[PDB]
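idk why but the lab printer keeps eating my pages so im just putting this in chat instead. protein + magnesium ion:
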Amino acid sequence: RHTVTMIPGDGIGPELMLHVKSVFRHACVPVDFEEVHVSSNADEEDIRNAIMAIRRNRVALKGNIETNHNLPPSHKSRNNILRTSLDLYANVIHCKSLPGVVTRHKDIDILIVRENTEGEYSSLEHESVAGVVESLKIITKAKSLRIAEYAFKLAQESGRKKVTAVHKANIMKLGDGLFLQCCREVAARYPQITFENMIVDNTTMQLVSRPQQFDVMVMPNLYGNIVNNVCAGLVGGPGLVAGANYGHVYAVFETATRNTGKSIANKNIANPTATLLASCMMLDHLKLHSYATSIRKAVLASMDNENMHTPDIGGQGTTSEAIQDVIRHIRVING
Amino acid sequence: VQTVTLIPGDGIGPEISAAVMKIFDAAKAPIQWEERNVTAIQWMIPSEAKESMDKNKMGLKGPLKTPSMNLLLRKTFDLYANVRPCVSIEGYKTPYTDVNIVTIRENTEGEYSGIEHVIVDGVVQSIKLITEGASKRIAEFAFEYARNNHRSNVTAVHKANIMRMSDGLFLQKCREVAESCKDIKFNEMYLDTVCLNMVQDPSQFDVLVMPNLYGDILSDLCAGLIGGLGVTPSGNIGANGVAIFESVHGTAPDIAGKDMANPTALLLSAVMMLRHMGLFDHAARIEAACFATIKDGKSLTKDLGNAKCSDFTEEICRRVKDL
Ligand SMILES: [Mg+2]
Ligand SMILES: [Mg+2]
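predcted complex ->
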């Protein structure tokens, strides 16, 4: 039995965590969740104890913590503090077209590897004179090499063929230039993988017209934010895609789009797919591959059934009805 | 009958620019064309290029070759506001058909401050600059644009959750202009939310106002929804009433003089130009003539019909005559 940190988060986080536990029970998953809450408190003790809990358990499943952007700059994103404190350097999401979820594009199969600790998320800002604000985007060789190594290794291990570095090196000559140069050094050690690069604006144009051209994509922090959400949208939205955050030792799992979803919270309409797929992802990481495969086949099979669809993908079903169907699919798998 | 500075540019630049002049005359527009070739010299743009624009106020620009001339023009004329109206085009069919969005990009600062430092070996700092003055001005323009073009909603797009002090200040200036302009409906949205929703239901968005990089990227994404850079207008508003309207696609050198080019974008930028000054009547005619031509079928260009540039141009002229 494994002990895994669970951080319910805000909005749809807590309600979906209950369904994760419920699904884990029916599948007899040898996992015990140790819950840690993070309030809206300006004080950091909550987010620090959560870090401590993940340091101990090494693995976590979390909902999204709301960032109040009206508070002073001293009050920093708790999701970001967490991400960067634990040095979870690789944000990884897999956007794949689901046969049961018909959107404007099909045959999308994209692995996005996003630098997850650096860049425009460095929280370095100051006001030199009144009304003049500077924000410091930090790009380093160590972290750019690190994320490129990850993307190429992933591409090779999962039998992918192309890695596309996404950047703005034509304008951000030194910063994005360094990121790209680091990707290129790694590319020389993976001669069997096609390496390409694309400016981030053009990338978004290509994604909304011919997203089938992309295989693995690697990029710094903000561009990952953008591309993740574009690709998540192309395949059907926030309710479908799981996100992983990998460090050398720790790992934290969530939904790809990192959305609070406060406007649909507590209405039994949230799509449970992304969160459940994230928990399978976590089970694989824990080497509980058979449990991961049971649940993942159950949730994917339920998504084939239009009747099980929640409103976010144009259905009319409730969350609990989707879970009912997922559980129905599981208890015939394990007898 | 006022004069418009014309910058044909390179490659297909002359061809398409000729096509726009032919259509503007066929519509009997009170505009005469004052051609000017910009080129960086001494850097700076030529004496006669600067001078035409300084008295005329209005320019039209085809695709240029690549000190960037587009960067020069921005600093020379303080082009602070990039405007890109993306409207889904009937006949030319993408997977998105309900699009009607204006992206308003702060064009002077933000993450294009031009300031990068090597802090130590293997550590680079790129400075994102957000100022009170520049943010208020783009916000004032965004709301002023909305009123004048009969637009209900303005959305400020930001990442103030992550960049609190900088995107926050930009937002604070957007809020101050908004409360002093209760006419237009104002909301705030995270950049990632905008991106997520845009590719699902782009019909929900109206006027998007944002700092430089977000604007740089979204203007391109929105253009990708409606067909590309080949069919998309663009305007740049500056200081002292100067304004340049432009093509943003390539020069396409490999078809430069084969009567094989598409002037839709340059035309739509020209239509956009007529609206800015106040000649709303003519603007509507040429536009409807253009849209009906594309909807019509065979008169199409190669990127769009197995037809030449000059037929397509000729059909539009013909149709704008029969208002
Ligand atoms: Mg969030
Ligand atoms: Mg752009």
